[PDB]
Amino acid sequence: MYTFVVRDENSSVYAEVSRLLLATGQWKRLRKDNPRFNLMLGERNRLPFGRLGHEPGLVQLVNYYRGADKLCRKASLVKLIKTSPELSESCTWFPESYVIYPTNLKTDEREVFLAAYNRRREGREGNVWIAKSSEGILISSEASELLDFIDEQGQVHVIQKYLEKPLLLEPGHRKFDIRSWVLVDHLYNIYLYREGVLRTSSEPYNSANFQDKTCHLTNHCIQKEYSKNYGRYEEGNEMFFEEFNQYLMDALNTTLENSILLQIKHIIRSCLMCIEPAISTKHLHYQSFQLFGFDFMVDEELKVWLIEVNGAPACAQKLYAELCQGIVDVAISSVFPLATSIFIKLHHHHHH
């Protein structure tokens, strides 16, 4: 009889994980502050990793990787991609981005951003950028509008090249992003969930008006909010992989695997193998696993771009049951055994 504790009660995913854990009949739940646990479903912020792995006779395991915020907060993602040889500035699946702090906070990249913005003015290339913080979005061709915006807020933001010719599904002439769910276990096996989701927009994309949000921003909430035709083509503004595969076959004469998924597996593995030495718990006194949500854009050439990594993602509601079961299969009972996998293991050893 293994034991466990729940310290994030706003987790959809780990709420269901709690339930099936009990339904085993071999897992008992303890109280938030009881130290004699095998398994921690920790809180999102200031999780006490320093207290883990000091209980004699308890193999302890937690559902987060200390350090993994380097990947899951946009300013740190930018910093990590351009400072690490494994990725580098020349990294071809990340939009050029620069980190910018507000006026009265003042390191920062403001001047080097406009260094490129001007050869973008001059270049006669698309010079439209998006500004982001880790609500609070601005898309503009004018840099100074960007930084005006940035510094009337108090947070550090990131300016990133907006992808001006995205892939647009038809009918609709509309945008989307792809969200992929990745589980990393205590062994640093990297597991991609076979099911992803396209978060579509219900609005025809329009290049001219960059300040009406809904045809440009794909996330579930804004479509359920400011959009006239939410739910029109697909249920929940959510197209799954069977459909998107068929659509690519029918309209573009490709498959999802060849056109997009090789690139997604490549990006997921490069990102995680990069930070692996900083976060691995291979010889630690406690163990981590973690569920990540990777978000990608696909341009009209069918090139995949990574937009962000999410450290505490929710699932699409039809997949909750399946994914969560897998989390217990692969992350939890691998460590604590009970009395066709839904995951693609991501590994590649090219010799050179």
């Binding site: 009889m1 034991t3 303890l30 109280r31 009881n34 130290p35 004699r36 209980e55 006779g57 308890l58």
Partner: protein, 425 residues
């Protein structure tokens, strides 16, 4: 922190006290002569905690024998080890106490107490570092309860910075001598809450039940009960009498077991339960049994409360890695029953020498809030009589006012409230 002064008072006090000296004298290799004839020197290394050394290399128990009646103490002198006790340490009146707390604390007992304290002072004046006193007594008679608690406050007055430890047998209707026992016990618990650091609550209800259900004895004698009591007493004093990785004394025991001063009433446990057995017991079996309510010497269900602190001692040769593993398993598997606000409240010790008659054994000292169940039982029996002032005349005839009774009942009910306080904290 070396010498302990042992005092046994009354019928029950002296009969369990004598069985105690028999048992540990055997464990330490001293015979009735007082002469050491053992084979290991673990036996003699700390034998000064309980024994003085006499001329001829004799060992004399640091033990004082007290009664208001001469009967039981002449039977002590008659018994197996009777002549190991220093004869000047027999201190006795002739009246008896009639199972009457007042006679023991206020009238007959006053008359005798100064003599006992003279012998006590004589024994403590020869001690390099006296740690304190252990008293054996029952709470339901008159000498043990009444006079023993009188002794306890006199000793606290003369030795206010020494440790007072008692083994206190609680009365049960299942084994009872008289109807006034809940009165005597409640008056005594009022004393014990104020004036001892550590009390082992030896419940005659639990001893009767173990004798009847588990040992399958259909009419238990005091001899059968006292067998269990001397097993428990040998266990709980192991880490005081022997050297180990953990060498304990009365004060460190108080420090680590008692988080709040009044909550110092311990529930002892023993495994394997034995009666006057060839299969050796496996460490997992010792650990399961010692924590089982059927091995508690205080008739309380430990699942009705929470363990404040726990101290276990395993006796015999066995794997201390297995004992560590097993103790850790029972904590981590029933962690709800251990308070979360005292970290690492279970401490475990091992000693290589087992009790006579066993290759392996385990003793358990629990400071549980489930002990309240005992004090409520007594409290109920008390009120059932006191609400009609029944039998009070035996006491008012010796000077006591009803007020003293209602005060003592109140203090015990407070003790119970304290325990419930910490059972939901």
């Amino acid at each position: 922190m070396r010498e302990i002064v042992h005092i046994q008072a009354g019928q029950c006090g002296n009969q369990i006290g004598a069985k105690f000296w028999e048992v540990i004298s055997d464990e330490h290799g001293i015979d009735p002569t007082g002469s050491y004839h053992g084979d290991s020197d673990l036996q003699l290394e700390r034998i000064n905690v309980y024994y003085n050394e006499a001329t001829g290399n004799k060992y004399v128990p640091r033990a004082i024998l007290v009664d208001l009646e001469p009967g039981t103490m002449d039977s002590v002198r008659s018994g197996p080890f009777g002549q190991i006790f220093r004869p000047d340490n027999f201190v006795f009146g002739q009246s008896g106490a009639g199972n009457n707390w007042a006679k023991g604390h206020y009238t007959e007992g006053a008359e005798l107490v100064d003599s006992v304290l003279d012998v006590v002072r004589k024994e403590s004046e020869s001690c390099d570092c006296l740690q304190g006193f252990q008293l054996t007594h029952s709470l339901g008679g008159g000498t043990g309860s009444g006079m023993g608690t009188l002794l306890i406050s006199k000793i606290r007055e003369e030795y206010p910075d020494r440790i007072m430890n008692t083994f206190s047998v609680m009365p049960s209707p299942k084994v009872s001598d008289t109807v006034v026992e809940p009165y005597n016990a409640t008056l005594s618990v009022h004393q014990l809450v104020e004036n001892t650091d550590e009390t082992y609550c030896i419940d005659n209800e639990a001893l009767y039940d173990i004798c009847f259900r588990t040992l399958k004895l259909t009419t238990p004698t005091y001899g059968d009960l006292n067998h269990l009591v001397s097993a428990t007493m040998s266990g709980v004093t192991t880490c005081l009498r022997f050297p180990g990785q953990l060498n304990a004394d009365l004060r460190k025991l108080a420090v680590n077991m008692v988080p709040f001063p009044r909550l110092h009433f311990f529930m002892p446990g023993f495994a394997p339960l034995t009666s006057r057995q060839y299969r050796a017991l496996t460490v997992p079996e010792l650990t399961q049994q010692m924590f089982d309510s059927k091995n508690m010497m205080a008739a309380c269900d430990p699942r009705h409360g929470r363990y404040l602190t726990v101290a276990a001692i395993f006796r015999g040769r066995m794997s201390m890695k297995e004992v560590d593993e097993q103790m850790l398993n029972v904590q981590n598997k029933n962690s709800s029953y251990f308070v979360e606000w005292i970290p690492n409240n279970v401490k475990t010790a091992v000693c290589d020498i087992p009790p006579r008659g066993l290759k392996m054994s385990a003793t358990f000292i629990g400071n549980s809030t489930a002990i309240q169940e005992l004090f409520k039982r007594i409290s109920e029996q008390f009120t059932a009589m006191f609400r009609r002032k029944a039998f009070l005349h035996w006491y008012t005839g010796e000077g006591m006012d009803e007020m003293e009774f209602t005060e003592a009942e109140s203090n015990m009910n407070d003790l119970v409230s304290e325990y419930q306080q910490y059972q939901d904290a």
